[PDB]
Design a protein around this ligand. Structure first.
Ligand SMILES: Cc1nc(C)c(-c2ccnc(Nc3ccc(N(C)C)cc3)n2)s1
Lengths: 258, 296
């Protein structure tokens, strides 16, 4: 209860820096690419949809993957097994009850055995040293959303749409902490829907002025402009649902007024 | 595991099995929790994944320390600091004479500090009950078993089929609310506070509806003035009987004025106005707190 709101925000900001993946890891991965990773994340989106997983689960899985990929070399042929274990772990951390391991085996179209998934779960836990309670974009946004005046569910959904987009491309997004991407997302969602701007309430809470946000914003704006053409479309398809007020239908602002 | 000698089994449950053990090299006595691990079928239980990730984040005198995790092909062991019994067993051994007021007060105070620490680090415990509150011979008490604990960076959704304990369950959960909040942990501690004072469980229900009615029989059937929104909660029914709130001087006769007032604020119906752990700690009830030692 808001007696902790501040302390918790402050503690998330501390933890996001400890749970950060290495920004340059993809180049050191001899056998995988930004593009294979994007294909994997888009598939996890779809897994989340098929099994009705919460959004947080998806963001946590991606965190676990990028951290895992920051110290272990993986062959392109084992990359889905990494993702499957990550999603299984995120599920267990975050859902009431996780889909059964066997369901996870099926959503890979049976390319790995039950035992392979379990052994990878163990290896992921060891490499992450059981540190599974990472801050995500979803969490910061949820904190930022309390400060809307007034609350507008179009903004909320569109901001969650953009945060999710950011997961697909390590390409720029591994450069930014989750609280910064949430800030960008919130601003660009607010602006898109209403023409308003990153509110002074959040400037004071986060300590981020619009300006400090601008590098991430220009990325996210390009990301949003280019979304309909992007190789991976699963986030768009998901955010067409009425659940989400169709926000991924909305027209992105051709300029930001920066 | 080569350097631990099991000494004796001290408990078994939903967790796993807990052994008292000694480190053959340093002489330290620890509690070893062996996680029930099915290697060919479901992997690492969610209880061990939550307890470990969260307990490794939490360093506080009133939260059980996790020392180490031993994780090998077939086995997962959590190594905890040893504490010498649970509050449930101490309440049982002390029924008749009752735990002394000053020791009750101390335990409450320490438990509130532990909780305030959990809550300020976005962790909800959700299963406070005397069997999960551990004591030592020097007057300490500590929160344990974080198997059902959740991180609440994003709101925690309730579980249609709650495995959570009946007796210490908050009204807002029994009436079907969508989300947990920190308020449920305060409600639990309130029940435990009362239990220590009276030497019996406050609300010992045998089913969910009986659990609710027992609460209503002591606190009064709540309505929109006491709890705005109640009437539109998923399992509220306009047919609930109407009971009067009871005089706390009768619910918890041994308590003084400050005690009744704190208790009444931990057991507020509306989770929005239920006292927080951090505010409880500033209550005047704690002015004269000491740190007595238990007769174990
Ligand atoms: C579930 C549990 N999860 C943990 C971490 C438990 C634990 C941890 C540390 N010490 C003890 N000590 C302890 C427990 C029980 C008893 N009894 C006498 C029942 C004595 C000491 N128990 S129990």
């Amino acid at each position: 209860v808001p007696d902790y709101h501040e302390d918790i925000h402050t503690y998330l900001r501390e933890m996001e820096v400890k749970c950060k993946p290495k920004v340059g890891y993809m180049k050191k991965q001899p056998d995988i690419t930004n593009s294979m990773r994007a294909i994997l994340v888009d598939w996890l989106v779809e897994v989340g949809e098929e099994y009705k997983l919460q959004n947080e689960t998806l963001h946590l899985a991606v965190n676990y993957i990028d951290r895992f990929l920051s110290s272990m070399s993986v062959l392109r042929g084992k990359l889905q097994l990494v993702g499957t274990a990550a999603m299984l772990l995120a599920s267990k951390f975050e859902e009431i009850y996780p889909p059964e391991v066997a369901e996870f085996v099926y959503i890979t179209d049976d390319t790995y055995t039950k035992k392979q998934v379990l052994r990878m779960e163990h290896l992921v836990l060891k490499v992450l040293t059981f540190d599974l309670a990472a801050p995500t974009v979803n969490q910061f946004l949820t904190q930022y959303f309390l400060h809307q005046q007034p609350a507008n569910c179009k903004v909320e959904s569109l901001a969650m749409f953009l945060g999710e987009l950011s997961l697909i491309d390590a390409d720029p997004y591994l450069k930014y902490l989750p609280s910064v991407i949430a800030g960008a997302a919130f601003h660009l969602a607010l602006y898109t829907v209403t023409g308003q701007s990153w509110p002074e309430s959040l400037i004071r809470k986060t300590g981020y002025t619009l300006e400090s946000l601008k590098p991430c914003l220009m990325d996210l704006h390009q990301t949003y402009l280019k979304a309909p053409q992007h190789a991976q479309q699963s986030i768009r398809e998901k955010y067409k649902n009425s659940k989400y007020h169709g926000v991924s239908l909305l027209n992105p602002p051709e300029t930001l007024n920066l | 595991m080569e350097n631990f000698q099991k000494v004796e089994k001290i408990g078994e449950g939903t967790y796993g099995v807990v052994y008292k053990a000694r480190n053959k090299l340093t002489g330290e006595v620890v509690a070893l929790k062996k996680i029930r691990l099915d290697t060919e079928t479901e992997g690492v239980p969610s209880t061990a994944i939550r307890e470990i990730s969260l307990l490794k984040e939490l360093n506080h005198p009133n939260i059980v320390k996790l020392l180490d995790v031993i994780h090998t092909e077939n086995k997962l062991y959590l190594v905890f600091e040893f504490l010498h019994q649970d509050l449930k067993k101490f309440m049982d051994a002390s029924a008749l004479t009752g735990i002394p007021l000053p020791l009750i007060k101390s335990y409450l105070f320490q438990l509130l500090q532990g909780l305030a620490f959990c809550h300020s680090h976005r962790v909800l415990h959700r299963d406070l009950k005397p069997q999960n509150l551990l004591i030592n011979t020097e007057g300490a008490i500590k929160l344990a078993d974080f198997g059902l604990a959740r991180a609440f960076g994003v709101p925690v959704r309730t579980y249609t089929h709650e495995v959570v304990t009946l007796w210490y369950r908050a009204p807002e959960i029994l009436l079907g609310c969508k989300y947990y909040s920190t308020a449920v942990d305060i409600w639990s501690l309130g029940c435990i506070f009362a239990e220590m004072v009276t030497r019996r469980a406050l609300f010992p229900g045998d089913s969910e509806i009986d659990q609710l009615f027992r609460i209503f029989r002591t606190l009064g059937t709540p309505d929109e003035v006491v709890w705005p929104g109640v009437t539109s909660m998923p399992d509220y029914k306009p047919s609930f009987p109407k009971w009067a709130r009871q005089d706390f001087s009768k619910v918890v006769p041994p308590l003084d004025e400050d005690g009744r007032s704190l208790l009444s604020q931990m057991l507020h119906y509306d989770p929005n106005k239920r006292i927080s752990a951090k505010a409880a700690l500033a209550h005047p009830f704690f002015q004269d707190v000491t740190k007595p030692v238990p007769h174990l």
